[PDB]
């Protein structure tokens, strides 16, 4: 992983559905 947690590499995060990406932005914004 890079520019993202530790596992998720940028490409793998963007291979997630756009609505999952959004929810993870809210998860990160509700944990930091």
UniProtKB/Swiss-Prot annotation:
Posttranslational modification: Monoubiquitinated. Protein monoubiquitination prevents POLI binding to ubiquitin via the ubiquitin-binding motif 1 and ubiquitin-binding motif 2.
Role noted for this protein: Error-prone DNA polymerase specifically involved in DNA repair. Plays an important role in translesion synthesis, where the normal high-fidelity DNA polymerases cannot proceed and DNA synthesis stalls. Favors Hoogsteen base-pairing in the active site. Inserts the correct base with high-fidelity opposite an adenosine template. Exhibits low fidelity and efficiency opposite a thymidine template, where it will preferentially insert guanosine. May play a role in hypermutation of immunoglobulin genes. Forms a Schiff base with 5'-deoxyribose phosphate at abasic sites, but may not have lyase activity.
Known tissue expression: Ubiquitous. Highly expressed in testis.
Family: Belongs to the DNA polymerase type-Y family.
Compartments in which it is found: Nucleus
Record field: transmembrane: none
The protein's name in its UniProt record: DNA polymerase iota
Recorded domain comment: The catalytic core consists of fingers, palm and thumb subdomains, but the fingers and thumb subdomains are much smaller than in high-fidelity polymerases; residues from five sequence motifs of the Y-family cluster around an active site cleft that can accommodate DNA and nucleotide substrates with relaxed geometric constraints, with consequently higher rates of misincorporation and low processivity.
Protein source organism: Homo sapiens (Human)
Subunit structure: Interacts with POLH. Interacts with REV1. Interacts with ubiquitin.
Residue ranges of the motif Ubiquitin-binding 2 (UBM2): 8-25
Lineage of source species: Eukaryota, Metazoa, Chordata, Craniata, Vertebrata
């Amino acid at each position: 992983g890079h520019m993202f947690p530790s596992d998720i590499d940028p490409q793998v995060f963007y291979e997630l559905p756009e609505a999952v990406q959004k929810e993870l932005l809210a998860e990160w914004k509700r944990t930091g």
